[PDB]
């Protein structure tokens, strides 16, 4: 639809907002991000491409915490993801100020969805060029969401975004079939590492650094924490041996 | 809002295109008519259902604006509904709150016409796609019937019709209208004029009719103030319409 | 308000109304003028305003504005009842930061011919200003319903004169309007 | 004229027409029916992605204690409308001291839609809203709002790609029964009726995962769990 | 005014006198001071009736919004909304609120929001002009996990003394009982509690 | 504008390896000793304690601000547990900024605040700010009534900065506890129940709750008879 | 305090204004002209709070001059006094009122009539045969009430003004350092002794 | 001023005196204090008359508009809520003290509103300078099972106690009766207990006692 | 953004013309002819009604001629709703002037202010101009009887006799032919009606198709009732 795609918030004759579909093309060009819901928590992982030797290892962190209990990871235009996370942090702070409890993950999800959907209402704004995987632990346990440029979000057992989304999604499907009782957080960390490595059997034009985070009632006291040191190296070893 | 500019503009021929297109929307609308008698005004319209499951009783095509002023429309129903709300509020805030009195029909019609005009010139809005027939009574001017068009131009009529059937209806009304017509005759002529333009089914469920007539002290809801007039606006029931149609 | 002084009285009669005021303009004890008429009219509706003379002038000019615009829009002169409502709403619009005034409306409705006064529609007599309590005493003693216009003139004039004689801040002449649907007569009274 | 809500030479608003097309994007059908003292909403649930959490996939919203809303159309606009409607209902109760009626909320949301049809800077929402309640005065009530800012009350309604098939079957049922409502005393039988009728119209059996069901009663609007829908489906299999 | 809330084994009981005074005149002898802001969240109001009614209406509105967006509010959340109102308007509003509520996880909770808009979670709270006279009695007689009957008696005795001594307190004793089972309203007349 | 529920004195002291801060647990309501479980020492991380006196509602507001500051500092900061943790000096400067801005808007937070901590370099931090934004440091700090009675006693231990390296944690804690006892004898708005926090550059934060004033002397009161001549 | 006096005679308006300016303990000036010409046939004198009077009078003068340029026409003394009254009546309701009392003397060349308007700081306007502000009337009005005649010539008006000034100098305790006298007539505005 | 409200078995009565005072002076002997908010919702005000009039007019306008918008009969709780919130916004600077009574689809209602925005429900209420006398009568004669005629008698007796015993109250009793399922029955001057006796003589002057300087006709 | 849809009113063409003004003038060239004539003793306003039907209330329709105050009237050609907006503004301005100066507004001051309002819409704000031309008839004590015209540009000019609307070239030709400075109001009434009769594109000039007004000596300001228009049409021999 070459007539109706020049301006956000225009319906095409078939009812489509083409600028949102093009923002989705921006997402599909991004690196692979995944999320896994475990029996008491969520695991986030992201492919960080090593565009050169000169990038400082471990330093260009892509996962973001919101409040203390929400993790966010996104694929696409990284600055749009930072912008969305800044709004999320404002929303969480406002909720906790008025209601002293930490913002529930479904509430936070709707706050983000409304903000993203608002960027589809006017021609004076661009849609978000990110899809965001986010989640955490609240009083009702673990929740995992993936939010699209349209503002559409759903809860997921596992989620994948970016260039490797299809292979990741197939591996998450197998993981959900094989562990119907629910995966543990440490095993979910190992699986997330494997899945990111398998998704990087696409997009192999460059090397990559794995970044993992998690939020688990047992393993983190329901706080979002980065996976570092021994457990990260163990996850990388598991991923490499599962390939090699 | 970045649309601070007018969307209605003059063409080289001097047409305001959006206003002519709004009038085309009106002319495709369901037929409405009005007839002024010596002792009242009739306004009437077809109620076209969107579905056999819809409760047409829940959709009011005829609206009270004041106890003595009624409106009907042809064209875009939602625009009419929003204009009714604005007309009611402006009748209060621009007049009743100042003078303790409901506006005369002509002044409320002016206020509505102003609202409609502003949509033809202010930034970022289209015109309203409705034409209104506004019927009323006031102590000094008596009974009045006005048409307001999308431009916000308004004209007093003895009788008129608007919408798809308005040409045949206006010709029939020119045949039938006279200075000696009583309200019961005007209702009879209104029912005849709608019969010739309804899509077959013609009854008190497919017709909405209201009158501006005598004061109705039974509708006032209180007693003991002899100077407080009952409302002159009255929507006819479907049973009253059927009773009249059986005798038509 | 009392800085300037002044009194207005209106009375209804048989198919008539009277409205009357003193003419003094003061500045506390100093008398400034005896040409400060407190009674205005807007078509056939008469408005007396007592109180602060700057507010009297301002409100007269404002009601002239509003009743001219009314006549232009409505294509008829305002009636006394409608004008009373207009006065009420215009004064309450300054409910905070008031005009320091006491309006008195008098007239005859063009259509019904009913005499009307307000300061409501207290139909016998209406009193405003510095000598209000003297005026209440006089009118409540002298007033009779359905006075003919000549007797109404005598009654309102004696009420005004005798009340004014006991008010220091009002007087130096009085004006009486006798209003009939066909005819308004202005009369000036000497004060002693 | 095709791109913003101004008139075409035919007096049409093409963006409004195209917003109606968006309402079928989800390919979901919904059905609402009135009992004597309940209102029931049935909506299809389609959750083909095994990675979804099905409990989060819903087009039925609890607007207030008493008002339910079902949406046809994409979920982001549905959630926009739902949030606005929730705010409106709470604000109405605060301003006026009583629970917002379903018809009044439908009027208010329809007026917002009309504003989007008239002001160029806001697009229409691509959603059809069906509000359901048992009104304190009007009793069981269905009011349906659309992108034109049209709304009306319904005896019963359906929305979606197959709305004509469901609507004509409902119309035939009312022709068969000569009533404006489903003559049953308790909402479980109205749910079973509505499910049976959706099955007959769509020609497909439903698992408990293939549906979501909303019930308005005098006390509250509530949504059935999948196991309550199971109980109704086995009741249909056995009744 | 004399208002109480008391946590007990099954939940919480709110108690109030019914007297509203304007100076020494009793403007309302049958006041209901126990205001529902949510199904199982109630408040006792003391201080300015206009301020506390306005606050309670605003809290009820905010909690209705919360319920429709985020599900059922906790009693702590209601107390937080009360706090934000009382604290941000502490110069204009003279409101001492007791907030009490039940939920199945926390059971009964009591929060007092004195003047100034501090919040204090307590096993029981007393407030209003008549509470002064019963601080000693309540401290000597409260115990954790009383039965419903013992708690009703404890409130009845305490408020009966507060009514005996405070001219600004009197009339009926109203109670609201919040438990798993539901909400129950109680009333005790002077010829019951003046015999205590 | 006017404080309603109030905490009373916070007292504090540098010692050779750290800082000690103590405050009682009472919220008074005028002369009514209304609330008896009010914690007034707010730890911020493992290196800082904020002691607050004055209006308890403003104290609760400050405690919220401090929790928010820790959350914000953790954002996009992988060293928030390390070299980019909050220092006592950062927390103090933020609080002093807020206090002075609030004063300048004529809407004071009606509090006196002592920030006690150990800097990452191991320096003792001990600084006061009040509702005016007035700030000062000393080897001993006390708010309110403690400024008049506790400071003399603590200064008998630490009179100058060269006394700090000579002063052990045992001596400092004993001095703080005795000063709390003196306040209980002489402040009509004090409680015998208090909290004490120790921040040591080696042993970290030790936060002691539910301490009680002990070894009070009252038996000499038996001998006091009348007010002059009553035998 | 300041003295401003006005007398409307048959052919002209005479305005008389005191020359003193006093700040605190000292007479700073003995020659101050408390008037502004608003138009070729309209003169305003003013008295009141220091600073307010001149700021007000110059604002009025600028507005009347702007009107005259825009219309190429001179406003009547009536229209000028109505405008000045409106500005004063506004100022009473403003955040800082002009504490300014004025006399406006003009010659209406359409009516061929002198006109004298007194306006107080409240915006109380009155057309008068003769006028004063503050205490100057307390001493002068009995002389004017006794001797004033509407058909007085300018010279009789000036002699009556001299009597009023002599009475002020006798009985009023301040020393106002005499008056400047301006005459407004068909020939315009001139200064006299 | 004395105003009372009295609920009865199928409705509510409100009643008022008709004296308006300017300080110690009776400005109007027959002021109508019962003001219609809507056909079946009526209010009566103590305090400054203008504030009662204005807030009643504004609320009645908004109630009528809201009734048209909702297509429903207005509710007394809506008038109450709107009055409450308006008066609270003005922090008691609107000196309106109201009794609000009415009938609606939810039944009969009776409320008082104070100028600060505080409200209470009651079965019987009184306001104004005569409120203590009226309440003394209400407290001594009110009962739960009042009929309409008993409630009218009680309300007018309470107003009469105000009229006889409060200087600020006098002249006539006005009553409005709102039964469920019926038109509101406004009873202007239901009692007239204070009719002035005839003067000892007529004071009509002979024509010409007043000296007139001059006369002119005014064009109008 | 919205820039795509902005027609850019208030720009010069390459010839230095304002196209929206020229097109509004074209719009006015299709409106009913209005005529002003300044006699020695007064002013005539006459206008043709374009809308006609047997069912119109010509006795209450007052679409061409409006009083602005007791001394000034306007005749309108063009969009009556825009004219009513401007007329209300002018009425307010006249009353503001009376409030300020306690004198009736000079005619030129009113005309200039309304023309400046019209000019503003040609220079700033991106809105379309008002599609109305006015004839102003007034009296004041400075110039006496004055006749002005104004158009969408906000130009205004004084005239002895003027026409606006459809047939103005013909009307001005006939007025040049027959106007005289000495002529009385009763002469100008005839000249106005004869010019309308010779310029109307209807079959015959009749009292229902006419509006008529005069300002004549105080000054009195008469809008003719239709019977008076019959009387004047027979007196002139046109009917």
Curated annotation (Swiss-Prot), chain A:
Post-translational modification: The alpha and beta forms are probably products of the same gene with different post-translational modifications.
Keywords assigned: Acetylation, Cytoplasm, Nucleus, Proteasome
Superkingdom, natural source: Eukaryota
Localization in the cell: Cytoplasm; Nucleus
Biological processes, Gene Ontology terms: proteasomal ubiquitin-independent protein catabolic process; proteasome-mediated ubiquitin-dependent protein catabolic process
Endpoints of the signal sequence: none
Any single Gene Ontology cellular-component annotation: proteasome core complex, alpha-subunit complex
GO terms of molecular function: mRNA binding
Membership in a protein family: Belongs to the peptidase T1A family.
Note: Present with 12000 molecules/cell in log phase SD medium.
Stated name of the protein: Probable proteasome subunit alpha type-7
Covered residues, full protein: 5 to 248 of 288
From Swiss-Prot, chain C:
InterPro entries: Ntn_hydrolases_N, Proteasome_beta_3, Proteasome_bsu_CS, Proteasome_sua/b, Proteasome_suB-type
Subunit structure: The 26S proteasome consists of a 20S proteasome core and two 19S regulatory subunits. The 20S proteasome core is composed of 28 subunits that are arranged in four stacked rings, resulting in a barrel-shaped structure. The two end rings are each formed by seven alpha subunits, and the two central rings are each formed by seven beta subunits. The catalytic chamber with the active sites is on the inside of the barrel.
Disulfide topology: none
PANTHER family: METALLOPROTEASE TLDD, PROTEASOME SUBUNIT BETA TYPE-3
Compartment(s) of residence: Cytoplasm; Nucleus
GO annotation, biological process: proteasomal ubiquitin-independent protein catabolic process; proteasome-mediated ubiquitin-dependent protein catabolic process
This protein's UniProt keywords: Cytoplasm, Isopeptide bond, Nucleus, Phosphoprotein, Proteasome, Ubl conjugation
Pfam family, one: Proteasome
Protein's recorded name: Proteasome subunit beta type-3
Signal peptide: none
Organism from which the protein derives: Saccharomyces cerevisiae (strain ATCC 204508 / S288c) (Baker's yeast)
Covalent cross-link Glycyl lysine isopeptide (Lys-Gly) (interchain with G-Cter in ubiquitin) as placed by the record, residue numbers: 66
Species lineage: Eukaryota, Fungi, Dikarya, Ascomycota, Saccharomycotina
Family to which this protein belongs: Belongs to the peptidase T1B family.
Gene Ontology molecular-function annotations: endopeptidase activator activity
Phosphoserine modified-residue sites: 27
Gene Ontology CC, one term: proteasome complex
Swiss-Prot record, chain G:
Pfam families per record: Proteasome (PF00227)
GO MF annotations, alphabetized: endopeptidase activator activity
Phosphoserine PTM sites in chain numbering: 76
UniProt GO cellular component terms: cytosol; endoplasmic reticulum membrane; nucleus; proteasome complex; proteasome core complex, beta-subunit complex
UniProt modified residues of type N-acetylmethionine: 1
Biological processes per GO annotation: proteasomal ubiquitin-independent protein catabolic process; proteasome-mediated ubiquitin-dependent protein catabolic process
Protein's name according to its UniProt entry: Proteasome subunit beta type-4
Known role: Non-catalytic component of the proteasome which degrades poly-ubiquitinated proteins in the cytoplasm and in the nucleus. It is essential for the regulated turnover of proteins and for the removal of misfolded proteins. The proteasome is a multicatalytic proteinase complex that is characterized by its ability to cleave peptides with Arg, Phe, Tyr, Leu, and Glu adjacent to the leaving group at neutral or slightly basic pH. It has an ATP-dependent proteolytic activity. This subunit has a chymotrypsin-like activity.
Keyword terms: Acetylation, Cytoplasm, Nucleus, Phosphoprotein, Proteasome
The keyword Coiled coil appears for this protein: no
Note: Present with 21800 molecules/cell in log phase SD medium.
Species this protein is from: Saccharomyces cerevisiae (strain ATCC 204508 / S288c)
Cellular compartments annotated: Cytoplasm; Nucleus
Family from the record: Belongs to the peptidase T1B family.
From Swiss-Prot, chain H:
CC annotations in GO: cytosol; nucleus; proteasome complex; proteasome core complex, beta-subunit complex; proteasome storage granule
Subunit organization: The 26S proteasome consists of a 20S proteasome core and two 19S regulatory subunits. The 20S proteasome core is composed of 28 subunits that are arranged in four stacked rings, resulting in a barrel-shaped structure. The two end rings are each formed by seven alpha subunits, and the two central rings are each formed by seven beta subunits. The catalytic chamber with the active sites is on the inside of the barrel.
Function: The proteasome degrades poly-ubiquitinated proteins in the cytoplasm and in the nucleus. It is essential for the regulated turnover of proteins and for the removal of misfolded proteins. The proteasome is a multicatalytic proteinase complex that is characterized by its ability to cleave peptides with Arg, Phe, Tyr, Leu, and Glu adjacent to the leaving group at neutral or slightly basic pH. It has an ATP-dependent proteolytic activity.
Family (UniProt): Belongs to the peptidase T1B family.
Keywords (A to Z) from UniProt: Cytoplasm, Hydrolase, Nucleus, Protease, Proteasome, Threonine protease, Zymogen
Location in the cell: Cytoplasm; Nucleus
Name of protein: Proteasome subunit beta type-2
Catalytic activity from the UniProt record: Cleavage of peptide bonds with very broad specificity
EC numbers on record: 3.4.25.1
Higher taxonomy: Eukaryota, Fungi, Dikarya, Ascomycota, Saccharomycotina
